[PDB]
Amino acid sequence: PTFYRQELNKTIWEVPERYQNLSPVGSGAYGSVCAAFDTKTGLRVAVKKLSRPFQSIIHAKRTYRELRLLKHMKHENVIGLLDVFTPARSLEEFNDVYLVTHLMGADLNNIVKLTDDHVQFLIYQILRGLKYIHSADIIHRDLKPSNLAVNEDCELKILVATRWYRAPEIMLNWMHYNQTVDIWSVGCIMAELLTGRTLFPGTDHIDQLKLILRLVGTPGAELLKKISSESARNYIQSLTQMPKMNFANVFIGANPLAVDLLEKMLVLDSDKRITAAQALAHAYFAQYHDPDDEPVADPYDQSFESRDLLIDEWKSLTYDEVISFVPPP
Numbered sequence: 414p415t416f417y418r419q420e421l422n423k424t425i426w427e428v429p430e431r432y433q434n435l436s437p438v439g440s441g442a443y444g445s446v447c448a449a450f451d452t453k454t455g456l457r458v459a460v461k462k463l464s465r466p467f468q469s470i471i472h473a474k475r476t477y478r479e480l481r482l483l484k485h486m487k488h489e490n491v492i493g494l495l496d497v498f499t500p501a502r503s504l505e506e507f508n509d510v511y512l513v514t515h516l517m518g519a520d521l522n523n524i525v526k527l528t529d530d531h532v533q534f535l536i537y538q539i540l541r542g543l544k545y546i547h548s549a550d551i552i553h554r555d556l557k558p559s560n561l562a563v564n565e566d567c568e569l570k571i572l573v574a575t576r577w578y579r580a581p582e583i584m585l586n587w588m589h590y591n592q593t594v595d596i597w598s599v600g601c602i603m604a605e606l607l608t609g610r611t612l613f614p615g616t617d618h619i620d621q622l623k624l625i626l627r628l629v630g631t632p633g634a635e636l637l638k639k640i641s642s643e644s645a646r647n648y649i650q651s652l653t654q655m656p657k658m659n660f661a662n663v664f665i666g667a668n669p670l671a672v673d674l675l676e677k678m679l680v681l682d683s684d685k686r687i688t689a690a691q692a693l694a695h696a697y698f699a700q701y702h703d704p705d706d707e708p709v710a711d712p713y714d715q716s717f718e719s720r721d722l723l724i725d726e727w728k729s730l731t732y733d734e735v736i737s738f739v740p741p742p
């Protein structure tokens with residue numbers, strides 16, 4: 414189809430005729446997004462242009478990783494792809510990638526204190542998206558208010574210091590963390606929507622861990638005997654020991670079912686944290702939970718993550734992924 418060129422805040426854009434009325438939303442290191450009208454579907458869409466997708470092996474692999482993940486994500490509460498395109502006619506020319514999805518209004522950071530029913534529906538949608546993501550053996554690792562797209566209907570999709578929502582095993586740089594790092598982030602988000610304050614606004618990674626242990630208590634011997642690192646065990650055992658606080662006391666006034674769920678998500682031992690699938694069955698989501706509409710994902714191959722390839726190999730794989738793309742109906 415026919416492409417049209419255009420400059421927007423220094424960034425150049427080459428998009429098909431079907432996308433009209435471009436309009437910068439925001440930009441940064443990874444790339445610029447534009448809002449647009451999709452003439453073919455009647456939809457407002459976001460169009461993300463990647464910054465220099467094949468600058469290096471790192472960039473080429475990151476580009477491939479993002480396109481593969483977005484092509485796989487097919488769920489009401491995870492961002493997926495309406496379209497992917499390049500203005501290039503062959504592999505030799507290919508140097509730009511554009512990604513298209515349903516325009517969302519605002520982030521969960523912008524919507525902020527919410528009422529208990531709003532908190533139930535937003536955390537329900539996150540957990541339903543995370544059940545799907547985790548079922549593919551994907552770990553988000555970066556769940557925070559800014560990575561949650563919400564529209565005026567309170568419909569939520571998974572896409573402010575990052576450390577504030579990070580599980581304590583990532584503060585001390587554990588290399589074998591599991592998917593419940595994401596449940597820790599959900600617990601921190603749910604706290605912040607109930608209270609109107611960051612649960613653990615650490616000034617750095619050391620302060621961040623001290624605020625966490627202040628609420629959840631320093632580890633018992635059951636957790637300490639799973640810490641392989643001698644420096645980390647020495648450090649954690651050398652802190653002044655604080656007990657697990659009563660969550661009923663800290664979240665005074667909240668739904669006791671919200672409090673119970675928070676206790677199940679912010680357990681220090683990652684092996685004892687509630688899973689996304691378990692959390693959806695919790696009494697706090699009785700108004701919203703439906704076990705025949707909480708779907709899992711098709712299996713997801715990320716063996717490419719263990720491969721060391723040339724820039725042009727990552728580039729051609731990415732090109733291959735643009736060409737095989739089938740739009741949703």
Ligand SMILES: Cn1cc(-c2ccnc3[nH]ccc23)c(-c2ccc(F)cc2)n1
Nearest residue numbers: 438446459460461512513514515516517
């Ligand atoms: C950081 N970031 C936000 C958006 C985004 C998505 C939907 N609605 C939005 N409204 C304002 C930004 C935004 C994207 C994006 C755009 C297109 C894609 F295909 C994939 C991701 N990245």
Ligand SMILES: Cn1cc(-c2ccnc3[nH]ccc23)c(-c2ccc(F)cc2)n1
Nearest residue numbers: 581582585587632639645681682683684
């Ligand atoms: C290196 N490392 C692993 C863990 C860890 C955390 C949670 N669950 C786990 N299961 C097996 C190891 C492990 C921690 C840690 C524990 C307590 C803290 F207060 C701060 C960090 N450090």
